[PDB]
């Protein structure tokens, strides 16, 4: 059938089922008199076309109230199933209207109080209006809205009135009380016939009140309206009846058996399943499932026809619609629970998924060339491709998709691969606009008008939408996916709420509207929904990317595939990379050295919260340097290159070294020793012979030998004027290893953060290597609570220049051949926002991951050319140290620069003492006791009188 005629049919079955139930009840009750209440209680219609006036030809009488039919064309709308609760609601509202009162249905939200009122208003043909009293409430418009209701004869519904705050609630209640007291006079015992209509005052002037209007106040009440409003308890709707009627109207044979099964299933879904902020098992969600099941049944019957015929299993069709809507929103833990519940409510029947073999073969080709992992089931990658296919389904159905899941899942990769697969399969191009919120101001996101010139300037999202709409450039044949990667927040989605819903139009502050073209898909790549309004989550479908979807084997496969093909030096490098990947391949498998080490490291204690991707990224970054130490070794020695035999023994030990300094590079020395001991008993790589010295205290060298770090610490003698001077670090056991790690992580230009107690020596260890490198010029930046992205923008404008579009706008340092590093002093200091997102952290993340950001002057993408970031932090447990978000944390490895030990302090200050005592040659023999006293006294003062007693007892090598 055509959709309009389909809706007409469905309405007819609904009303005819209502009439059948009414007639059956009348027959069973043995009713014979036409004036009996059990018949007079039903909504009865009386049509008499002989009357000349249009308005009162049709009369509707519920119990005794005799309303007319306001002949207003309602369009098509939706008709509510008339349940016993709906019957009671109709009766009570009609009685309230007869007594010139109002209706105030109360109950939990989702029952259908607002819809019941709207259905009643549509039944009489009245122009019923619904006002949302939760938010987006325009109190200024009500002054004329109420006058319109009075002078037109239109109804009014206030959804969740109590949600209004007291200041607005008192004024709205005063207006409603005035209206009700003016409407109560229309039924005066002595002034029933009103020659002069009763008037009220709302706009500070008298306005006529038509008797046709009404006002309803739904809740979840002020003493002004207690005497002028009837109340009804819409507590629980009859979901079984609603389901049974919708199933019967959708053509499902045996509707009651399906309904009294699906309703208990949706009841169990609220108990046996972990509570989530996005789970919707209410009546509205049930309806969407039933109409989807009807569509699926019609598709099945019409497909069987092209190959009446009513023998399909109805239960297997009702569980396919459920599994195509609830599974994408399910976390990895609830998925085995949903099928367990299905095996109880619907025993014996099973869910069969559409194969979609047309797209699962373009996924295998978009992958395996982006060096990603592909699956087809219980094998590796099956869950990931499954999530990609579900995301494709949500894109097909909705347009405001919201992929959600913990940091470390393949959310970004999933939608990128989907875009490329769609481009290949359908021949339609795909362009992604990754707009990052919480990095630019909401004004810069949308725009504003200056109150003096009233000139309208567009923001980022507004400009992007305007370019997509106005300028074609393959409009309908380019897939514009505006991915809103970042963190969801009410502030910047207030404007988008008009776009996520079916309106698909954006209302700019100047009043201009922009309609979203059907190809545009507004996707929010977010991490969690802790700070998302219920409207935003409810206006769009979603898929949950749980952390179990992306497995470790898939990460290792991606790494080894990138290593064997992507050259580190942007030919022999590729060969040595392939040889290295072959060497570490047995360890980079399921279980094995790397997986066991990671599992053991997850149960340790680290200064910052432990993320798998952070450790894996650091391990991969240092392994990328392990294949560059081979390149330099071969370049230095053209003859006698390091063959496979020496490569094996070099890289087997380098893998263990990198594992130790990545999985325990952010923990205490005891934790490092624990990891080393655990590795020693589970590895097959030759380790240091001496058992009393930790493996951490060794270096792999270039000859594949464990050379201890103490062999690489020189004994230096500083000049007298340069004793304890700024920027003078004496070689020790820590400044020989942390410096090496810093050089390794800066050779890859990887952003990193040094985390350690105040005064330990983070800045000293960093500037000892930054300025040593000839091309690593350092720009100093200090990050405090009040720091905002504007500081980074000012630094860029001060030290960098915008190239005039070589290939797009590019931000590059002023001088050529030099790399700028913006040392972040206390990167975790910036203040925590009220919605859990540090704006500067999300701004630096945008360019650490996507390699750039968006200018606020022309809404143009600018890409960083030679900009590097380095960071420093006190431990997050200290006051004012806000822990960093996982999304930025996984990109930056951290090093724990702990307080120098006693002996290390001896080797550091003893040297300073000797150079200082050169001014007094008579006391050279007393240098060692002086240091032994200084360090001992400092240790004694450090052990006691800690921060517990006072917040200013900071004892550091600075003292």
């Amino acid at each position: 059938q055509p959709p309009l005629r389909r809706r007409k049919l469905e309405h007819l079955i609904t009303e005819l089922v209502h009439q059948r139930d009414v007639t059956r009840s009348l027959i069973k009750s043995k009713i014979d008199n036409a004036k009996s209440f059990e018949w007079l209680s039903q909504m009865r219609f009386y049509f008499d076309p002989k009357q000349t006036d249009v308005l009162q030809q049709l009369s509707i009488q519920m119990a005794n109230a005799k309303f007319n039919y306001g002949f207003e064309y309602l369009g098509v709308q939706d008709k509510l199933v008339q349940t016993p609760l709906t019957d009671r609601c109709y009766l009570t509202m009609t009685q309230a209207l007869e007594a010139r009162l109002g209706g105030s249905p109360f109950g939990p939200a989702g029952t259908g109080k607002t819809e019941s009122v709207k259905a009643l208003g549509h039944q009489l043909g009245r122009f019923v209006l619904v006002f949302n009293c939760d938010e987006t409430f325009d109190f200024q418009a009500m002054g004329r809205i109420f006058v319109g209701l009075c002078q037109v004869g239109a109804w009014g519904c206030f959804d969740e009135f109590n949600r209004l705050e007291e200041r607005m609630l008192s004024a709205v209640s005063q207006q409603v009380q005035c209206i009700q007291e003016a409407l109560r006079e229309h039924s005066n015992p002595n002034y029933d016939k009103t020659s002069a209509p009763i008037t009220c005052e709302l706009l500070n002037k008298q306005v006529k009140v038509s008797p046709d209007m009404a006002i309803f106040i739904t809740m979840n009440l002020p003493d002004n309206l207690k005497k002028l409003f009837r109340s009804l308890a819409m507590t629980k709707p009859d979901r079984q009846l609603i389901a049974q009627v919708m199933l019967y109207s959708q053509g499902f044979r045996t509707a009651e058996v399906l309904a009294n099964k699906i309703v208990p299933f949706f009841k169990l879904c609220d108990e046996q399943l972990s509570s989530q902020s996005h789970y919707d098992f209410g009546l509205r969600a049930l309806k969407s499932v039933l109409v989807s099941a009807g569509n699926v049944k019609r598709e099945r019957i019409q497909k069987i026809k092209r190959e009446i015929a009513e023998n399909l299993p109805e239960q297997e069709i009702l569980i396919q619609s459920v599994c195509e809507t609830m599974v994408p929103k399910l976390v990895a833990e609830d998925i085995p629970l949903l099928f367990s519940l299905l095996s109880d409510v619907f025993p014996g029947v099973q869910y069969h998924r559409g194969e979609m073999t047309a797209l699962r073969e373009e996924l295998k080709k978009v992958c395996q060339e982006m060096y990603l992992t592909y699956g087809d089931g219980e094998e590796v990658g099956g869950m990931w491709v499954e999530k990609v296919l579900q995301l494709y389904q949500i894109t097909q159905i909705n347009h405001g998709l919201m992929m959600v899941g913990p940091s470390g899942s393949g959310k970004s990769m999933a939608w990128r691969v989907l875009l490329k697969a769609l481009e290949r399969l359908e021949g339609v191009e795909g362009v992604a606009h990754i707009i990052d919120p919480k990095a630019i101001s909401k004004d810069h996101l949308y725009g504003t008008l200056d109150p003096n010139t009233r000139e309208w300037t567009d923001g980022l999202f507004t400009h992007v939408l305007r370019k997509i709409i106005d300028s074609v450039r393959g409009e309908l044949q380019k897939r514009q996916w505006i991915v809103f990667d970042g963190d969801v927040d009410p502030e910047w989605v207030e404007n988008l709420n008009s776009v996520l819903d079916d309106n698909k139009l954006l209302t700019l502050p100047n009043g201009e509207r922009l309609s979203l073209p059907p190809n545009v898909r507004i996707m929010f790549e977010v991490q969690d929904l802790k700070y998302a309004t219920l409207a935003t989550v409810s206006r769009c479908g979603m898929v949950w990317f749980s952390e179990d979807v992306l497995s470790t084997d898939m990460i290792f496969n991606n790494f080894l595939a990138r290593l064997r093909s992507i050259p580190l030096d942007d030919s022999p490098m590729l060969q040595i990379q392939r040889d290295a990947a072959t060497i570490m391949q047995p360890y980079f498998t399921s279980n094995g050295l790397v997986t066991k080490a990671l599992e053991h490291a997850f149960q340790l204690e680290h200064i910052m919260d432990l993320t798998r991707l952070r450790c894996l990224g650091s391990l991969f970054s240092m392994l990328h340097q392990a294949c560059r130490n081979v390149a330099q070794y071969n370049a230095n020695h053209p003859d006698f290159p390091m063959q496979i035999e020496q490569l094996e023994r070099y890289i087997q030990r380098y893998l263990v070294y990198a594992i130790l300094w990545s999985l325990s590079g952010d923990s205490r020395l005891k934790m490092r020793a624990e990891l080393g001991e655990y590795i020693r008993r589970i590895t097959t790589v030759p380790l240091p012979t001496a058992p009393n010295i930790p493996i951490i205290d060794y270096e792999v060298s270039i000859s594949g030998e464990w050379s201890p770090w103490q062999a690489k610490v020189p004994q230096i003698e500083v000049e007298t004027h340069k004793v304890a001077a700024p920027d003078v670090v004496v070689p020790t056991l820590d400044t020989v290893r942390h410096e090496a790690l810093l050089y390794t992580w800066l050779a890859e230009h990887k952003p990193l953060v040094l985390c350690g107690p105040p005064g330990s020596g983070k800045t000293m260890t960093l500037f000892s290597a930054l300025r040593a490198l000839p091309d690593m010029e350092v720009v100093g930046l200090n990050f405090s609570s009040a720091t905002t992205p504007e500081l980074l923008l000012k630094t860029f404008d001060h030290y960098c220049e915008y190239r005039r579009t070589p290939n797009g706008v590019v931000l590059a340092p002023v001088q050529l051949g030099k790399w700028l590093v913006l040392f972040c002093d206390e990167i975790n200091l910036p203040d925590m926002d009220k919605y859990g997102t540090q704006r500067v952290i999300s701004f630096i993340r945008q360019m650490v991951e996507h390699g750039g950001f968006y200018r606020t002057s022309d809404q143009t993408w600018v890409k960083l050319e030679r900009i590097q970031f380095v960071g420093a932090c006190n431990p997050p447990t200290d006051p004012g140290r806000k822990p960093l978000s996982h999304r930025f944390l996984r990109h930056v490895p951290v090093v724990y620069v702990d307080y120098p030990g006693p002996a290390s302090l001896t080797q550091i200050y003893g040297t300073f003492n000797r150079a200082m005592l050169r001014l007094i040659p008579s006391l050279r023999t007393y240098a060692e006791p002086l240091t032994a006293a200084m360090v001992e006294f400092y240790t004694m003062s450090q052990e006691r009188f800690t921060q517990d007693t006072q917040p200013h007892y900071i004892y550091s090598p600075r003292e």
Partner: protein, 287 residues
């Protein structure tokens, strides 16, 4: 006082362009906060006994500061009213035919205001324009004229909104667009969505002069039994009320016809699917 005697010597008005290619004053926070600080400082030093170096240097400038404050806090209101009414009177059409006296009075007011803007732009110095005589009085005259004409415009909007009371559901700007674009009847159809329950478009004639029927979001059409001619009712409210009344009448007539048709189906036990489906197709879902 040393900085006060020199801050006024070097002070620009910060002229900015307008969409009508005219100059306007943009800086206001500097023109208020700094002047208030200076006037408070001069009042304090005159009050403070330590003033025997400036026996007479601030009284001759206290009146200057008062004049600056009065001129600029009337100028800001004049400017905002002028730009708002300029947008209202130039953006929407038919504002010349509808309320013609208001249009001509605003044209004269805008001519005077633009002449004053050119005068202050030729000498963008606050001292050089405070010396100009008659600026203050002309500014109060302009403020009064803008207030009066804006009040008249609001009264006209209320008068037009009282007729066809469905206009009370839309804002002032939307109502202005509706009443202004009388010729551009294709722009009205973005406002019917809020003025009715389901009605989203009006099916006009071939030349867009006679309303033949209405529509909805889905596309369901309700042909009018008696079409209404906009050419015989040029005012928008009149033919809108006629559309509403004709819609009511058409709904009543189609309901009568539908109930007459369905009496036959109801009385007879035997029901043919073909005729019943045709009856469903012919009539609207509401009916």
């Amino acid at each position: 006082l040393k900085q006060i005697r020199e801050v006024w010597n070097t002070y620009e008005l910060d002229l900015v362009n307008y969409q009508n290619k005219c100059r306007l004053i943009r800086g206001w926070d500097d023109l208020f906060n700094k002047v208030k600080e200076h006037i408070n400082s001069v009042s304090a030093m005159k009050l403070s006994p330590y003033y025997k170096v400036f026996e007479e240097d601030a009284l001759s400038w206290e009146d200057k500061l008062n004049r600056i404050m009065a001129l600029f806090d009337v100028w800001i209101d004049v400017q905002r009213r002028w730009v708002y009414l300029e947008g209202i009177f130039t953006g929407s059409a038919d504002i010349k035919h509808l309320l013609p006296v208001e249009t001509q009075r605003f044209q004269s007011i805008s001519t005077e205001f633009l002449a004053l803007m050119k005068k202050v732009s030729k000498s963008p110095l606050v001292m050089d324009v405070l010396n100009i005589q008659g600026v203050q009085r002309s500014l109060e005259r302009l403020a009064d004229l803008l207030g009066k004409i804006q009040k008249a415009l609001g009264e006209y909007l209320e008068r037009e909104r009282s007729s066809f009371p469905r206009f009370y559901f839309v804002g002032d700007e939307d109502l202005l667009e509706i009443i202004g674009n009388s010729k551009n009847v294709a722009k009205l159809q973005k406002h019917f969505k809020k003025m009715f329950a389901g009605v989203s478009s009006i099916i006009l004639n071939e030349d867009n002069s006679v309303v033949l029927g209405i529509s909805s979001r889905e596309g369901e059409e309700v042909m009018f039994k008696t079409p209404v001619s906009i050419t015989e009712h040029p005012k928008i409210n009149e033919w809108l009320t006629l559309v509403e009344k004709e819609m009511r009448v058409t709904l009543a007539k189609l309901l009568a016809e539908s109930v007459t048709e369905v009496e036959i189906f109801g009385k007879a036990t035997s029901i043919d699917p073909n005729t019943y489906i045709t009856w469903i197709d012919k009539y609207q879902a509401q009916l």
